[PDB]
Every structure is written in C-alpha cells, then in structure tokens.
Design a protein around this ligand. Sequence first.
Ligand SMILES: N[C@@H](Cc1c[nH]c[nH+]1)C(=O)O
Ligand SMILES: N[C@@H](Cc1c[nH]c[nH+]1)C(=O)O
Ligand SMILES: N[C@@H](Cc1c[nH]c[nH+]1)C(=O)O
Ligand SMILES: N[C@@H](Cc1c[nH]c[nH+]1)C(=O)O
Ligand SMILES: N[C@@H](Cc1c[nH]c[nH+]1)C(=O)O
Ligand SMILES: N[C@@H](Cc1c[nH]c[nH+]1)C(=O)O
Ligand SMILES: [Mn+2]
Ligand SMILES: [Mn+2]
Ligand SMILES: [Mn+2]
Ligand SMILES: [Mn+2]
Ligand SMILES: [Mn+2]
Ligand SMILES: [Mn+2]
Lengths: 143, 146, 143, 146, 146, 146
Amino acid sequence: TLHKERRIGRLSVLLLLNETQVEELERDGWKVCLGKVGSMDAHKVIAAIETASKKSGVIQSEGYRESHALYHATMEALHGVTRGEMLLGSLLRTVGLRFAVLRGNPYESEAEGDWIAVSLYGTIGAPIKGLEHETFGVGINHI
Amino acid sequence: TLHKERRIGRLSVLLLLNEAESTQVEELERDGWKVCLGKVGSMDAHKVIAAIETASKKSGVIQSEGYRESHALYHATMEALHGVTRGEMLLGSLLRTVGLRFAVLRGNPYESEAEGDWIAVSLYGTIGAPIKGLEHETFGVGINHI
Amino acid sequence: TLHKERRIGRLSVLLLLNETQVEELERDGWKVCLGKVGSMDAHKVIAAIETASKKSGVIQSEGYRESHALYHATMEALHGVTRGEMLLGSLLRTVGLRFAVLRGNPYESEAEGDWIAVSLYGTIGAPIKGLEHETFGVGINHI
Amino acid sequence: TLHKERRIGRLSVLLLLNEAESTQVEELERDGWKVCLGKVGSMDAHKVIAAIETASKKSGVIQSEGYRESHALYHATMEALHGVTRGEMLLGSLLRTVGLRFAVLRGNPYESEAEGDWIAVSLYGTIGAPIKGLEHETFGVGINHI
Amino acid sequence: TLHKERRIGRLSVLLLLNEAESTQVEELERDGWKVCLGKVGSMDAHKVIAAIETASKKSGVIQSEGYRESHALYHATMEALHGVTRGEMLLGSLLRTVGLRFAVLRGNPYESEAEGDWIAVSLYGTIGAPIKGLEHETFGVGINHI
Amino acid sequence: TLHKERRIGRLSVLLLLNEAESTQVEELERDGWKVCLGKVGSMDAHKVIAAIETASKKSGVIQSEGYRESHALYHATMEALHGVTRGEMLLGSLLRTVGLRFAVLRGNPYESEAEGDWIAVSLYGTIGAPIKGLEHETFGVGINHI
Ligand SMILES: N[C@@H](Cc1c[nH]c[nH+]1)C(=O)O
Ligand SMILES: N[C@@H](Cc1c[nH]c[nH+]1)C(=O)O
Ligand SMILES: N[C@@H](Cc1c[nH]c[nH+]1)C(=O)O
Ligand SMILES: N[C@@H](Cc1c[nH]c[nH+]1)C(=O)O
Ligand SMILES: N[C@@H](Cc1c[nH]c[nH+]1)C(=O)O
Ligand SMILES: N[C@@H](Cc1c[nH]c[nH+]1)C(=O)O
Ligand SMILES: [Mn+2]
Ligand SMILES: [Mn+2]
Ligand SMILES: [Mn+2]
Ligand SMILES: [Mn+2]
Ligand SMILES: [Mn+2]
Ligand SMILES: [Mn+2]
C-alpha cells in the first residue's frame, strides 16, 4: 500500500516540471538526481541517466543489481517518451530532455525496500527548433 | 516555437497531480483553455478510452458531433496509454488493473496563433494486480493536434 | 527476382479495391479467395480468412504447413490494419473489412515455389457508423 | 459518413500501383486534391520519412512553414511504415532494405465539408536483403487528419 | 560475473526440457536454489501468469506477502512471455493457444554475494491453433533481480 | 502431430546448452537433421542475423541460392531475436550488447511426411551493458516452415 505522502512517481514529476525542492526531498528519506540531455541517440539519453545516477549517490556504481534496476526503469520511461517505437534519430526525431531520478521506499511497510523512479520531460520533434511538442515518461522499478 | 507560459503538456500534468482547495481549472479556463477532469479505474482498457472520450464530449473539450475531433483525441488517449502500459497496451488480459485520474486539456500552446488548437491527454494513478495493495504508480501523456 | 507481370502483392490489392478479375487471375496460375468480415474481434477476422482460404482451394485444409504460412501472412496484414497494437475491440475500435488471398509464384525462377498474399481493405473506427476512415494491410509469406 | 467517390486511401493506392500513359494525377487535382508522388530506396528509415516530407513541401501538399502540418504528416508517414515494417520499424539495423514508391494525397474524403482536410501516405515497393533479387512486396497506408 | 556453475537461466531451461528415477530439483535445492515446476495450458495469457504466480507463492520461491517479490516475478514472466508470443502478447484474441511447462528458479547466479537474489521464469511447450495437431514449439525465458 | 522423438525446438536448445568427447551434432545428422553451430558477439543486431545466415549457407542448412529458404531463415531468426531482446529488437542503440551461441536445425519434426522441412534458430548467451560484468542471461528460439 502506497504511502500518500511518499508517492515516488508523483514526486519525481512534480520535481521535474517546477522551475531547493531537492533539499526538502533529501531531508525526507529520498535519494535524488537531476540532469539534462538533448540527443537523437537513445543510448546517450540512457548513458547520461546512469552516469548522473552513479555520480550522485542514487545507485551503486559497484555491482550489477542496481544498474539493472535503473536500466529497466529508464526503458519504462523511454516508452512514454517514444510512444511505440523506441527510436529517436532513426525515425527523424530528436529530444531535449530534463530528467529526475528518485530512490527510496514509497510504501507503508518497510519490507517493500527501496524503489527507483526515472522521470523524463521535454520536447520531442524534428531536427529543427520550432518543430516539436512536449513528451513525457515515467519508469518505476524495485531496487 | 513553444511558450514558457502555455505548455499544454506540463500544465495538464500539474492539474492532474494537484489534489485541491484552490481552482487551478478556473485559471486555465479564464485563459482560453478547454479543460476536463475525471477518474477511471478499470481492468478493461476500452473503458478508459470511453471514459475520457465521453467526458471530453460532455464538457465541450472536443466536439460531440463529427469525427475529426474524436479522432485527434483517440490518438492522444492512445499515446497516453503507452506511457501507462509501457509495451503491451493490455491490462486485464495481462492480469493487471488500473486506478486512474485523467486530465484532458484543449487549446493552442504556441507563440504563433497559426499553429491552431491542440489537445493533451494526461493520465495518472496506479497499475498493479486486481488486489488492492499490490501496485505502483503509472504515468502517461499524449499530445495531438486538432 | 520478381516477375513484373506477377507481383502477387500488387495484384491482390488491385483486386481488393476495384468494384471477373478473379477469372483472369485464375486463368493465369493464380489461386484466389475473396471475402468480407466486420468485427471487433481479431480472431474472427483471422478465422474467416482461414475458413475462406480452405473452403476455396487457396491452401490445404489437411496438414499444418499451409495453415502456418497463411496465419503468419494474415498477422503481417493485420499489422497494417492495426498499426502498432494488434487490438480492435479492446481499444474501442472495430473493423468492416474486405479481404483477398492469392497463392502462386511471383518470381521468375520456378524454384521459388508458391507464396501466399493476404490483403485487407476497409474501415477502422469507433463502434459507430460515421466515425472511421480507411485501413489497409498486406501480408506476404512463402508456402 | 464516407464517400464512394472520395476515399482518400483507396484513391491514393490506385495512383501508387498504376505505372502509366494517362494522367490520373490531373483527374484528382482537377477535383480539389493536393497530390504528391515520389520514389525512395533506402537502408535508413529516416531517409524515407525525409523524402516524403520534403516532396510534400515542395509540391504544396502540406505547408512548408509551421509545424501543425508537418505533424499530421509525420504520424501518417509513421502509420504507413507500420504496414511496411510489420512490427519493428527498422530496416538496415535488421539487415533489410526497401525500394519504395510513395504517394501523398491531401484533401477531404467526407460527405460533410465540416470534417475538414485529411492526408494519406501510401507506400509500395520491395523489402528484402541489401542484395538485388532477394525480396518480396511491401505495402503501407497511413491516414491522418490535418 | 556470472558464476559458470550457477547460471540460473541455463539451469531452469535444462530442467524444463528434461525427460527424467532422477530428480534434478533435488540437486538444485541441495545447492541453494528454490525451484518450482508446473504446467498450464490456455488461450488466455492472464491464466499462465496467474498459474505461475500461484505456484511460486505456494511453494516458497517468492513471498506471498508484500509487493516487491510479486513485482519481480511479474516482470520476469512478462519477459518470458515475449519469447513465447514473439511480438503480440496475445493468445485467444489472435486465434492461438499454448500448452506450457514452466520452471521458476531463485538464487544468486553471480560470484559476488552482493548481487543478492535473482529470479528466472522459463517456458516451453507448444503454440498453435485451437485445433490439436496444428502447432509448433515455443520457448521463453525471463530473468530479473529480486 | 509433433513426433515426440524429433522436436526440433527442444533439440536445438539442448545442443545449445550442452557443455560436451561426445558430439551430439553427429547423432542429429545420422538422423536426417542438418545442423549448424556458431557464436557471434555484438551490439549490432544485423551482425547476429548476418552471422547466422552466412553460417547456414556455408554449411548446408539452407540454400545459398534463391529467396525462399533465405526468407524462411530470416523470419525464424527474427522470432528468436524477440526472445533475446524482449520488446525492443535493439542492442547498441539501447546501450546494450549480446554474446550469443547459436544453433540452426533443419528437418521434419512431424509424423506426417507431408509437413515437409521446418527450421529452428536458437540463441543463448548474455545481454547487458557494454562493460564486461554487468549482464544476465538471455534466450531465444524461432521456428518456421521452410
Ligand atoms: N511529434 C512527433 C515527433 C516529431 C518528429 N518530427 C516532427 N514531429 C512525436 O510524437 O514523436
Ligand atoms: N508491475 C506491473 C503491474 C502489475 C501486475 N501485477 C502486479 N503488478 C506493471 O508495471 O504494469
Ligand atoms: N482512427 C483510429 C480508429 C478509431 C477508433 N475510434 C475512432 N477512431 C485508428 O487509426 O485505428
Ligand atoms: N522478408 C523480410 C525482409 C528481408 C530481409 N532479408 C531478406 N528479406 C521482411 O518481411 O521484411
Ligand atoms: N504458428 C503460430 C501459432 C498458430 C496460430 N494458428 C496456427 N498456428 C505462432 O507462431 O504463434
Ligand atoms: N538487463 C538488460 C540489458 C542491460 C543493459 N544495460 C545493463 N543491462 C536487458 O534485459 O536487456
Ligand atoms: Mn534485464
Ligand atoms: Mn485513426
Ligand atoms: Mn508460427
Ligand atoms: Mn507527435
Ligand atoms: Mn511494474
Ligand atoms: Mn518477409
């Protein structure tokens, strides 16, 4: 059962859209990461979220287990951004994204352990400036 | 070019995530924005499409008669369900259910008036098993022209 | 190398859209089947094409090999009709379709054997009359 | 309701499959139809999207300036590539190539003028390995509102 | 680094395809593996998932309480179904059915004791028309951290 | 009806996972099966496909000339890749790579001599980040009539 006050998905988004909310979240038991990425190569958008998440202390740089949790969460977020085909550049479109990574327990029971949320917000469009609209994605996984 | 003050997607989400109590709906409307808000919980994805659709028709978000409007919204709803289902646009057949809250926002988000009106379909809620506690959050935003 | 005069895909479509072209095609070495299907259940659209194909002599009712060839071809056609999600009814949409099945060799070499083409044309829309547009699909497989 | 005389999809295909030599383009145009025709062969799917797009811009099928037009056509091209790729919208990364012919038709296909204008993207050609003979036919039709 | 002697994927599959007075489930358990075997035949995916989840909770492979382990086993099954369905995670609605045998394995397949527990869902059986003899083999394996 | 002794899927997989002075390829060939084994590691799907196709044509599993058998082996590989990629048939473009071992088997797995020849492509290895130790097992099997 989700704890009304710690819905990690909702929080990672509210954090992503508003222009230190991080301090507040960190004051509560949240591990938080933030970054920007503009690319037409999905692997760059993925490598950046991983690099940022490991740089800050959101997930362990050592081992595979947390990288697995984060990778799959990003994949679930990239789904909301690409809507059907997980392709950017190859389908003549590129993204300018802002992302947010949260790690912690969103449930009432302490036995649920930590979970990780990957959130993406920005524009998706043609390889030109004024040719795009908003794109959103949120990935949630157990870690 | 886009607007810092009129990003239909961002806005539509803000309204979706906020519980109370103030009227963020009044603000958007007063500002040339057609807005809809409803909540749907189903094991059938078609019920979620119908729900949003109908509400978008009662509240003059889109036109009740015709198809051109109902079409731009169908794909918006669809593109919103991708973020929600992430891969397989299936719920009950995949032993999963959704408890959702939705927001349909219609209006032009561009600096240039020539871009015409657009519509966004944002979704939020939970996705998990048929049983109550087992689940986590699920998000989805769809932006179509109209 | 395809034989300019016997492009099975092109022929199954030209046959599907025009209001006996079948006789002519049959006069050449083509096995042809025709039918109509209106449904919100994909399995019905699939079972009809199979039933029609076996009734007429397009494929063998006996055995699995030809049913396999036809099933996969229909699946490839259903892709063009559903565009992304192979769902009709469950995604609040239904179809009224006309289909065409062709069997024969479309290549210059006789060693290419027979191939089978599944073609679909009609409307895809809401569970209401004047709320739809055209949908098309063509599946091609070796048999 | 639809028209027996103005089904943008059916028509767009007829023009695509016919080789000569008469001018079926003259007929459609004379009858309030924006029409485009080109051929593209690529191992890169983006080149097929660009090709159709650009031609639709040179020939005033859609508007060169703005986005609202370029958007309705992108999804049409996309929905057309589903019929072509059938599952994975990939070509070269899946060791396959396409030799295509495309037709972009813009105009209203409904009995009621209120439905506004629509655009269809039909594709036809071959899909097979990089080598010449190895391949079979491939078809795809995309219909978006605009 | 995957400990060459404890490759959870490979083992679960070998168990799955083994015709054997010789219990392999015994060895696997003597060694720290929690093992579960089953069989479910159906034209409904949600029944296969359900069948695997219930067998897993009854035997001790995963916890009956809490979401965490259920979430882990769910996505793992999902990934195994991908191999079985190859494209469209649908059975009856695409006029096809499956007769599966299934293994679920839990343990640490790595050298480092920090990797913790992982889980593998493995499927093997047939897939084909509702009619008895028209079908061919199908296989699927999903691995996930738990 | 799948002849219990010649289940092409199961065999190809067992061969794939077998550590063995004991050649199984021998028995399979003594019995009418055309067998091919290989290994390809890469972050490019088109290389895996290519690798399988070349090995298959060099050894005699499929004809080097004509499209028919190539078309058969192509879709079969495609279906096997689905299990390996589970959702997105992409490797490097999704920051991941695979180290596969592969078997290709050709023969009639049915009782009736009319079913003719069928073909199975089976894959097993790892999938994970470009960096050495971060990965887990992956499996895939595609069956098709040839
Ligand atoms: N609007 C498109 C992206 C795009 C590319 N070019 C123009 N638009 C989408 O939904 O992804
Ligand atoms: N975790 C699943 C939903 C679910 C099904 N059962 C339990 N949870 C998802 O991401 O959609
Ligand atoms: N036009 C939709 C179908 C639909 C259902 N309801 C309205 N439209 C499509 O592309 O499939
Ligand atoms: N047959 C493949 C294309 C192909 C690749 N290589 C040979 N043919 C398809 O249906 O797309
Ligand atoms: N051969 C089909 C199953 C099937 C349906 N009808 C006949 N066979 C598959 O690969 O899923
Ligand atoms: N675990 C991923 C592969 C991966 C990419 N990065 C790390 N691991 C998969 O299931 O494909
Ligand atoms: Mn993984
Ligand atoms: Mn549509
Ligand atoms: Mn099959
Ligand atoms: Mn778009
Ligand atoms: Mn989940
Ligand atoms: Mn093919």
